[PDB]
Amino acid sequence: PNWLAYDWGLVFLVAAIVALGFVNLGSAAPDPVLLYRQSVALGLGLLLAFLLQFLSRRRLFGLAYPLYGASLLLLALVLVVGREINGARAWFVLGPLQFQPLELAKLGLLLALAKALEGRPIARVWDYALPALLTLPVVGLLLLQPDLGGALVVLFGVFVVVFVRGLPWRHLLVGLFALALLVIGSGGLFGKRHTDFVFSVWAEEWGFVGVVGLLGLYGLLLARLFALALACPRLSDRLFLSGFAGMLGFQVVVNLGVALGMPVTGLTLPLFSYGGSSLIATLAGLGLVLLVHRDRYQD
């Protein structure tokens, strides 16, 4: 953490998408008190992503299995002592504190699957079972809320990890598509409510150049993630980085089809749409990915 050998390009990409999100929220249905909550979320997010830099990658992958278990027990616990919002209890609300176990599940499952899938030889049966028995508790506890947007993100991440690894992945796509079935000019206005109340306003006030630029920022972000992914000697790191990039790109392309018209899910546009927990969790995951990239040439 003392040396700062990071990929600063990815840092600039995250910062650029975040600054666009903030300058849009200030015109996309603004409110004096609704911009403060997300500003405090950004502060918390940067702070948490910095705190996680005092963590070696050895320790991070040592926590691969405990974090997975804790996300499983927290997914189970949110079903009992959660708060209903849109018909599903998926949030822990302790006054000003809002923590959804879906994010912890995503990171824990990515770490657990990456670590358990770096031994090249496996028995001819566990190529199906190991990702199955590690993903099914998470997806099942995500459907008991019910929240299938996070279930889709999780399952598609697992698909990406398995596919990049070199294991049976067709059954995962079958499960993914089956679960997914039960669901103003070139210039714009320039600043002149549903979940998409941050993106439906941006797409109209900034038009084709705005959407093209934002999708370009997301394309460059996914490109830099997959470039950092194949730039890691360890296989577990390759898997972890690629799973993260998959989940992120998948939320983005889910919001695309939502805007086209899908049904809608609770999945926000990462770093861009309104939501303090999603911002904080995306920043924390990006901090993890940044620290595993900085420790890529170490033991």
Ligand X SMILES: CCCCCCCC/C=C/CCCCCCCC(=O)OC[C@H](O)CO
Interaction site with Cl ion (CB under 5 A): 9, 168, 170
Beta-bridge partner residues of 89: 84
Tokens of 42: 């950004």
Q: Which of 23, 51, 73, 215 binds ligand X (CB under 6 A)?
A: 23
Minimum CB distance to Cl ion smaller for 61 or for 156: 156
Quote the least distance from Cβ 227 to ligand X, whole Å: 22
Contacts (Cβ under 8 Å, ≥6 apart) of 256:
none
Would you tell me the crossing angle of helices 64-81 and 101-116 to the nearest 10 degrees?
A: 150
Minimum CB distance to ligand X smaller for 149 or for 175: 149
Quote the least distance from Cβ 37 to ligand X, whole Å: 5
Q: Which of 4, 80, 94, 97 binds ligand X (CB under 6 A)?
A: 97
By the rule CB under 6 A, 231 interacts with ligand X: no
* Separation between Cα atoms, residue 161 and residue 158, nearest integer Å: 5
Q: Which of 6, 7, 29, 37 binds ligand X (CB under 6 A)?
A: 37
CA distances from 225 to 55, 221, 247, 263 (A): 20, 6, 11, 29
Question: Footprint of ligand X on residues 38-77 (CB under 6 A)?
Answer: 39-41, 44
Quote the least distance from Cβ 125 to ligand X, whole Å: 33
By the rule CB under 6 A, 27 interacts with ligand X: yes
Task: Report which secondary-structure segment, H or E, holds 204.
Answer: helix 199-205
Minimum CB distance to ligand X smaller for 87 or for 96: 96
Task: Show contacts of 51-54: CB within 8 Å, 24+ apart.
Answer: 52/284, 52/287, 52/288, 52/291, 53/1, 53/287, 53/290, 53/291, 54/1
Is 198:28 a contact under the CB 8 Å cutoff?
Answer: yes
Is 100:277 a contact under the CB 8 Å cutoff?
Answer: yes
Beta-bridge partner residues of 99: 92
Tokens of 144: 């008991």
Decide which of ligand X, Cl ion, none touches 160; Cβ closer than 5 to 8 Å per partner kind. none
Q: Which residue is nearest to ligand X (CB)?
A: 26
Q: Which of 109, 269, 284, 289 binds ligand X (CB under 6 A)?
A: 284
Helices (H), 30-169: 34-51, 57-62, 64-81, 101-116, 126-143, 148-165
Q: Which of 167, 276, 294, 296 binds ligand X (CB under 6 A)?
A: 276
By the rule CB under 6 A, 228 interacts with ligand X: no
By the rule CB under 6 A, 295 interacts with ligand X: no
By the rule CB under 6 A, 34 interacts with ligand X: no
Q: Which residue is nearest to Cl ion (CB)?
A: 9
Residues that bind ligand X (CB under 6 A): 15, 18-19, 22-23, 26-27, 30, 35, 37, 39-41, 44, 96-100, 103-104, 107, 191, 276-277, 280-281, 284
